[PDB]
Design a protein around this ligand. Structure first.
Ligand SMILES: Nc1nc2c(ncn2[C@@H]2O[C@H](COP(=O)(O)OP(=O)(O)OP(=O)(O)O)[C@@H](O)[C@H]2O)c(=O)[nH]1
Ligand SMILES: Nc1nc2c(ncn2[C@@H]2O[C@H](COP(=O)(O)OP(=O)(O)OP(=O)(O)O)[C@@H](O)[C@H]2O)c(=O)[nH]1
Ligand SMILES: Nc1nc2c(ncn2[C@@H]2O[C@H](COP(=O)(O)OP(=O)(O)OP(=O)(O)O)[C@@H](O)[C@H]2O)c(=O)[nH]1
Lengths: 427, 74, 438, 427
């Protein structure tokens, strides 16, 4: 059977992964101690897609945790489900990253890649047939970018036959806190576009706006933002673990989703977001949800594709659903905005129907987007990088680490190719 | 008054001493590691009993998991 | 079994000697009377004392040593002390004249009629003992009575007993403090007569011992009581292997076989790491790592040897107390990787370790600390030749202008023997440099 | 019936044997007093392979204790099982060791070899027919090497038809404590090579690493090392004493283990090792055992054979297993590294399955290895030997004892012949 090995990296993915995993455990009904309480046969049958079995009826998570700062592991280990994760699984470093990409890409990773490779291949042998793997990290994160770019480069040669699912969060366009973040972003994405096949783009500003729009709760916790992105990540993974005539394999999906090889960047979408009174003020029906599914407010990934057009769209519907209401609502939206699509591809919609409703609500869905809305994203990162390389600010460090300006020259040339590429196909 | 050169027999530090002198001071207890540790962990004293405990640990759960097998089990 | 015989020549060697059994009695709890409490340890003499004391059916622990000196003044006083009942009356060999700081006078004039007496003493101890690993010689190079008299006796015990070990412990002459200008006469006289018979000679200098007292023990005016207790603690630590056990037990035979490189040179140096005041250890922590740094810290040695001016050959450490091989082997591994510590390339391995679980105890009315982890650090380096280099340029002038020669030639010696020791010393110094050259 | 008589030699073998025999008794369930408590039929019948019968159901061990230092023998005599050992078997000398190879080999041995030969032949005449003998000592040991070389030389000619099993621990590569040890080792190994047929190689540094790796217990005792090796020593001896569809005789094994006469040096390998939480975090399955027993970190003998290749491999499996899984793990590991074996011999694997598990662990195994991982060991001592023989350090004792430089000349030359012989077989 096809199983998946999870990869957690970066101090962000430290919080996403914990939230991502506890949702799954609570979804399947396993107690924090780990003794599963048999309630649903279907989730009992298909937990082995992600979890292996140990003694005592506990489902060991097949995820990999890597970082540098020990305190982060102590916190997640003291978290609600740290006991569920293995000290065997906890690999880390005797050093701090300094939020430095070059240190984590050449210096500190050098003595640590061996162990994690020895780690990941161990569970790779423990499992029989993988569809692939998925990675939680960030493009603008110090340890996450430094570690991931090394590992993804390595993981290709040993297993060039599996899925390179990458789950990365885009830092805020308006603010980056870390001032060398565009340097971290530019270096990583050069290898990322070279190495990955799929990439999720997520931004915090929209999450803040969505809280203003539908959560309406003023002061949230970052974990609640993790609760959001984990739910989106969970929904796309419900396909594999759950029955119903929807076609689940990411390869069933990705080939339907990408026209040309260098297209890896995709935009999530999710189903009813509800406020204080609207739980009892909402008639949960197909028309309203698909309306809310395709709301320019309801999106959360980067920014509005209203500036551009839609390349490919894929929709998965989770719950008691039927083909006729969806069929007409694709017809509804197709006739609603046909011109806002691209004439390059007609009927660019991909539909999957999961008959098993989620734990939390009956009618739900998830959306993944490939539109012409990524230009301004890397267009944004273009200007700062040119501005910063104009007078090489904050450069004496990486030279001491052993980096040269030449690496940047092709790297920006690589993104600028995509800028022309994304522009050329649509415009 | 000898505090200027208080060596007459030995130096005094009593006011800074709020405790006694009778015995020596060990930094910590390496025994604490020893009671925490069981030397015979490779061979616990749990003979046939734990065989049954693992025998009744939910073969059906394990069969649903990965098609478990004990003793010719279909 | 496992026992040795100690000897103490020189009134320098007596009061340092007296202290050790004053120390030795405490750890086994010997009362000043000579017997235990109603608890049972007496018998055929077979218990922790059998290696050190002779507690026969009479119940009196007889120390297996003889106090020999040429004047009663110190020894009859301790014969009126607190432990004189323990000591065998004629094991306190007293003389009636003085050797007048003269090597020859002690070696020739009075020695002839006295050594036969102590020869009777040693054989009567030889017959009663069973294992007789070796001897403990406490003496001094510039001995007013220690220097000259030791030389003849060590020859006599060597010629009749050359199959057993001899261990030498003498205060090295104070380099910049000269309590005797006849010391350079007798000291080199002692060395040349001992180079061809002595098996293992261990030295010490009082100035640094004093300098130890006020650097960390915080005593700017200590006494012998402190000084003798310090060296008494030293001999106690090395002798703990005979008394008790540990992870491994090592004997002086291994010390001899593994420390001395070649014939002639047999002069390592001892060092004890946790030499700290009580309050310091009270509000700090002790472990193997830091005391390992201190034991190899150059200022913690009691001879004016700067190790970076020399090179290391042999190094013996004896961990007494609660330790584990893990942090010990990891710490010494870091020492091998160290660049300042320059061992000779001839020895890739040079570390003789001894582990003893028993922690060293405090002494009542003492000034020491409260130690769990302790180590006596025996090591030999090439930075020691400067000591005899100091002696010879001291010597060459004082032989160039024949000072005090009329005293020595007036009693029966000539200049050839004084000449011999010089090229004998010159032989050693060229030996020291050629082993120094790799 | 074919039995074994044991010899405990050297001061290390004194601790080793004391640990080793109590493991046997507790495994068989005899109390420290010696009165066996009848619980298991199989161990009741097959105890005579090692033990003999005393009056009152007392099983006398057939071991002869030899040393020079009383305190070590008094300590083991005062142990919880010193009573089960015999004062008859306590032969010794009135001399100190000095940790000198020659004194024990020529001076101290001369007056003791007479007595020990009488004791063993009396023990030999006490029993009927041996498989052979096994010896516990060290190669770098001061006294054990001295008598160990003497005894093996003598016991060759009287009974040249039996098994010359040896169990010697290699000193620590980083430091040998004893500084004349490489002299003693080079002396010992010269006589070891022609007089032995089987050799066990053990190193404490790896054992120290094992404590850091899986035991994770910081501060063990030396005895905390002893049961570790005895369990491996017990495990290889479980096969004879216990029933099951596996061939037990060492001659079964040795002929499958030894292609050429000069191959005597063999390395141990042991099965599941567990940490603080992984007792309840481990799914005890034959794959993960086979995974773990074949781990680079799991070798404990000298070092990693990664630099070289595998000549012959033989593992004994103890517990409730089946014939098929051992095959398919054998296939898996064969496919896992097909090139890393020698083309010289295919199917270099010899498997045995003991159906009787340990008395508290069920899935277990023992591995004995012959790889091309011994070269560096004697090269290391080669520069040690050459450098010290370059300027004859510490030589005056052995000449004083009566040894001469010529003895060293062939001793290293034989080792040099062994260097190429291992090299030319593999490289
Ligand atoms: N965990 C976490 N990460 C956040 C949060 N907000 C923003 N981030 C970003 O997520 C990025 C990814 O984290 P990592 O890749 O693990 O960062 P790192 O490699 O340890 O180095 P730094 O980025 O300096 O922390 C960080 O750089 C942060 O900028 C948050 O609230 N929690
Ligand atoms: N070992 C030791 N030496 C001491 C002590 N006190 C002083 N010294 C020094 O040790 C030297 C003793 O040597 P000698 O004076 O020749 O001793 P001696 O041969 O027994 O005969 P005397 O001159 O009477 O003492 C003196 O020069 C002092 O400097 C002490 O308590 N113990
Ligand atoms: N029993 C024991 N032996 C140890 C230990 N650590 C290291 N060893 C070594 O095991 C070796 C073998 O012991 P023996 O052959 O009996 O040694 P020996 O001939 O009596 O003389 P030495 O080698 O000096 O001990 C010794 O040389 C030690 O170096 C330990 O903790 N316990």
């Amino acid at each position: 059977m096809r199983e998946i090995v999870h990869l957690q990296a970066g101090q962000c993915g430290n919080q996403i992964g914990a939230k991502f995993w506890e949702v799954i455990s609570d979804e399947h009904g396993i107690d924090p101690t780990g003794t599963y309480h048999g309630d649903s046969d279907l989730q009992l049958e298909r937990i082995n897609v992600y979890y292996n079995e140990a003694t005592g009826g506990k489902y060991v998570p097949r995820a990999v945790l890597v970082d540098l700062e020990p305190g982060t592991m102590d916190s997640v280990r003291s978290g609600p489900f740290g006991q569920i994760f293995r000290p065997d699984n906890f690999v880390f470093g005797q050093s701090g990253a300094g939020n430095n990409w070059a240190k984590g890409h050449y210096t500190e990773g050098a003595e640590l890649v061996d162990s994690v490779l020895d780690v990941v291949r161990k569970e790779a042998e423990s499992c029989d047939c993988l569809q692939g793997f998925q990675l939680t990290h960030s493009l603008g994160g110090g340890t996450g970018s430094g570690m991931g770019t090394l590992l993804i480069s390595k993981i290709r040669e040993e297993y060039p036959d599996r899925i390179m699912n990458t789950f990365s969060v885009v830092p805020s366009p308006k603010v980056s806190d870390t001032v060398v973040e565009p340097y971290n972003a530019t270096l990583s994405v050069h290898q990322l576009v070279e190495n990955t096949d799929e990439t999720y783009c997520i931004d915090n500003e929209a999450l803040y706006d969505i809280c203003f729009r539908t959560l309406k709760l003023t002061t949230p916790t970052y974990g609640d933002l993790n609760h959001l992105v984990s739910a989106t990540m969970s929904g796309v993974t419900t396909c594999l673990r759950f029955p119903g005539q929807l076609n689940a394999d990411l390869r069933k999906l990705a080939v339907n989703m990408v026209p040309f090889p260098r297209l890896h960047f995709f935009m999530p979408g999710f189903a009813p977001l509800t406020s204080r009174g609207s739980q009892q003020y909402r008639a949960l029906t197909v028309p309203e949800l698909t309306q809310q599914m395709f709301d320019a407010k309801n999106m959360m990934a980067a920014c509005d594709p209203r500036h551009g057009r839609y390349l490919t769209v894929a929709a998965v519907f989770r719950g008691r659903m039927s083909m006729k209401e969806v069929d007409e609502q694709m017809l509804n939206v197709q006739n609603k905005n046909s011109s806002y699509f691209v004439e390059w591809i007609p009927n660019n919609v991909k539909t999957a129907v999961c008959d098993i409703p989620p734990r939390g609500l009956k009618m739900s869905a998830t959306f993944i987007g490939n539109s012409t809305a990524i230009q301004e994203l890397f267009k944004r990162i273009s200007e700062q990088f040119t501005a910063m390389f104009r007078r090489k600010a904050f450069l004496h460090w990486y030279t001491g680490e052993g980096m040269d300006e030449m690496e940047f020259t092709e790297a920006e040339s690589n993104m600028n190719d995509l800028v022309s590429e994304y522009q050329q196909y649509q415009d | 008054s000898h505090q200027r050169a208080p060596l007459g027999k030995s130096h005094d530090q009593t006011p800074g001493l709020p405790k006694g002198m009778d015995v020596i001071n060990t930094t910590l207890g390496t025994p604490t590691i020893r009671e925490l540790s069981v030397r015979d962990t490779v061979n616990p004293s749990k003979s046939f009993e734990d065989v049954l405990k693992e025998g009744q640990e939910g073969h059906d759960l394990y069969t649903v998991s990965h098609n478990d097998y004990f003793a010719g089990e279909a | 079994m496992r026992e040795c015989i100690s000897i103490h020549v020189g009134q320098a060697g007596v009061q340092i000697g007296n202290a050790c059994w004053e120390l030795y009695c405490l750890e086994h709890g010997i009362q000043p009377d000579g017997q235990m409490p109603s608890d049972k340890t007496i018998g055929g003499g077979d218990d922790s004392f059998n290696t050190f004391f002779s507690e026969t059916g009479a119940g009196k622990h007889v120390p297996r040593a003889v106090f020999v000196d040429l004047e009663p003044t110190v020894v009859d006083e301790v014969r009126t002390g607190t432990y004189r009942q323990l000591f065998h009356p004629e094991q306190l060999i007293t003389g009636k004249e003085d050797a007048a700081n003269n090597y020859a006078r002690g070696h020739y004039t009075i020695g002839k009629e006295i050594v036969d007496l102590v020869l009777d003493r040693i054989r009567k101890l030889a017959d009663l003992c069973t294992g007789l690993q070796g001897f403990l010689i406490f003496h001094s190079f510039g001995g007013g009575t220690g220097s000259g008299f030791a030389s003849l006796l060590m020859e006599r015990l060597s010629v009749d007993y050359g199959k057993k070990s001899k261990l030498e412990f003498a205060i090295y002459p104070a380099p910049q403090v000269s309590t005797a200008v006849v010391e350079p006469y007798n000291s080199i006289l002692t060395t040349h007569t001992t180079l061809e018979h002595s098996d293992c000679a261990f030295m010490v200098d009082n100035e640094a011992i004093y300098d130890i007292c006020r650097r960390n023990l915080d005593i700017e005016r200590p006494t012998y009581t402190n000084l003798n207790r310090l060296i008494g603690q030293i001999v106690s630590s090395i002798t703990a292997s005979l008394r008790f056990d540990g992870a491994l037990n090592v004997d002086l035979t291994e010390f001899q076989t593994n420390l001395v490189p070649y014939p002639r040179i047999h002069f390592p140096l001892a060092t004890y790491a946790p030499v700290i005041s009580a309050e310091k250890a009270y509000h700090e922590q002790l472990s193997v790592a830091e005391i390992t740094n201190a034991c190899f810290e150059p200022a913690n040695q009691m001879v004016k040897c700067d190790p970076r001016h020399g090179k290391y050959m042999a190094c013996c450490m004896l961990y007494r107390g609660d330790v584990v091989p893990k942090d010990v082997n990891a710490a010494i591994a870091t020492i091998k990787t160290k660049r300042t510590i320059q061992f000779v390339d001839w020895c890739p391995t040079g570390f003789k370790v001894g582990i003893n679980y028993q922690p060293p105890t405090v002494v009542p009315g003492g000034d020491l600390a409260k130690v769990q982890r302790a180590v006596c650090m025996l090591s030999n380096t090439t930075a020691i030749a400067e000591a005899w280099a100091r002696l010879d340029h001291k010597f060459d002038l004082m032989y160039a202008k024949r000072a005090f020669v009329h005293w020595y030639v007036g009693e029966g010696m000539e200049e050839g023997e004084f000449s011999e020791a010089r090229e004998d010393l010159a032989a050693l110094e060229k030996d020291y440099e050629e082993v120094g050259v790799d």
